């Protein structure tokens, strides 16, 4: 299914903490729907945790 | 009169310069096409199999 | 070596054909549609 | 790395979104990602001095 | 010496639309095999 | 047989429009991360 890959991106990849769910953080879920598109790249988690980090500040920009 | 071949090589000229590598890529060399070569004309066959 | 490189240069080589295919779908989509709904005149 | 670059190794980065992969390529070196903008001479010259 | 019926002779063009279409997926099905059987070690 | 309603087409043209940008950067977004990752 999903749940189970989707929970490997945000837990054992993203190491995120669990009391951050999908509905407190839209942009996360935003990520996530391309993030699952690729099945490499999940030994540096550090690339995904600062894509989601420079995304967060992209969204908080004003202009 | 009659036309010499320099004649109309030089009037009909080139158009097609391409870069072509070394299978190491590790040299450029350019080549240039002359619509008046010789070779057009044989109408040959070309194909390359995988 | 040679045979990434090859693997580059070719996997770049259709990139831009299929967006000449798309562009061409998508022209067509769009004259067909707007044929459907209005007529030049 | 070793070979000049030709204009296709040179592949412009865009900050706004995604670019996982990019991230992912911080330590490799082949692929120079560089701003879409080109010093002019005079900002050039400035940066020499 | 109105819109239906012209809809008719786009289908007719949409048909080689499908035909270009299906030649465009052989391509690249093409490429593919041919890619995997060479340059892949 | 009577004139087909134009809207269902209209919405058709929009799915295929979006499938078609989707097509296009799909493709390119394939083909870049294949060069970053594998060719390098």
């Given at each position: 299914?999903?749940?189970?890959?989707?929970?490997?991106?945000?837990?054992?990849?993203?190491?995120?903490?669990?009391?951050?769910?999908?509905?407190?953080?839209?942009?996360?879920?935003?990520?996530?729907?391309?993030?699952?598109?690729?099945?490499?790249?999940?030994?540096?988690?550090?690339?995904?945790?600062?894509?989601?980090?420079?995304?967060?500040?992209?969204?908080?920009?004003?202009? | 009169?009659?036309?010499?071949?320099?004649?109309?090589?030089?009037?009909?000229?080139v158009?097609?310069?391409?870069?072509?590598?070394?299978?190491?890529?590790?040299?450029?060399?350019?080549?240039?096409?002359?619509?008046?070569?010789?070779?057009?004309?044989?109408?040959?066959?070309?194909?390359?199999?995988? | 070596?040679?045979?990434?490189?090859?693997?580059?240069?070719?996997?770049?080589?259709?990139?831009?054909?299929?967006?000449?295919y798309?562009?061409?779908?998508?022209?067509?989509?769009?004259?067909?549609?707007?044929?459907?709904?209005?007529?030049?005149? | 790395?070793?070979?000049?670059?030709?204009?296709?190794?040179?592949?412009?980065?865009?900050?706004?979104?995604?670019?996982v992969?990019?991230?992912?390529?911080?330590?490799?070196?082949?692929?120079?990602?560089?701003?879409?903008?080109?010093?002019?001479?005079d900002?050039?010259?400035?940066?020499?001095? | 010496?109105?819109?239906?019926?012209?809809?008719?002779?786009?289908?007719?063009?949409l048909?080689?639309?499908?035909?270009?279409?299906?030649?465009?997926?052989?391509?690249?099905?093409?490429?593919?095999?041919?890619?995997?059987?060479?340059?892949?070690?």
């Open positions: 299914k999903r749940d189970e890959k989707h929970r490997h991106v945000v837990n054992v990849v993203l190491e995120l903490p669990t009391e951050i769910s999908e509905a407190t953080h839209p942009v996360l879920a935003t990520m996530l729907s391309k993030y699952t598109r690729m099945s490499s790249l999940f030994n540096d988690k550090c690339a995904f945790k600062l894509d989601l980090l420079r995304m967060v500040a992209v969204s908080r920009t004003r202009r | 009169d009659e036309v010499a071949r320099t004649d109309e090589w030089k009037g009909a000229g158009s097609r310069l391409r870069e072509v590598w070394d299978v190491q890529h590790r040299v450029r060399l350019r080549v240039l096409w002359y619509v008046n070569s010789f070779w057009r004309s044989r109408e040959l066959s070309y194909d390359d199999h995988e | 070596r040679v045979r990434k490189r090859y693997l580059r240069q070719e996997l770049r080589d259709l990139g831009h054909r299929v967006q000449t798309c562009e061409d779908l998508e022209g067509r989509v769009s004259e067909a549609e707007a044929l459907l709904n209005q007529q030049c005149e | 790395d070793r070979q000049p670059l030709n204009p296709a190794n040179i592949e412009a980065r865009h900050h706004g979104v995604s670019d992969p990019r991230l992912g390529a911080m330590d490799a070196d082949e692929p120079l990602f560089v701003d879409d903008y080109r010093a002019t001479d900002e050039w010259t400035l940066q020499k001095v | 010496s109105v819109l239906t019926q012209n809809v008719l002779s786009a289908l007719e063009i048909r080689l639309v499908r035909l270009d279409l299906r030649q465009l997926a052989q391509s690249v099905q093409d490429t593919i095999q041919h890619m995997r059987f060479l340059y892949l070690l």
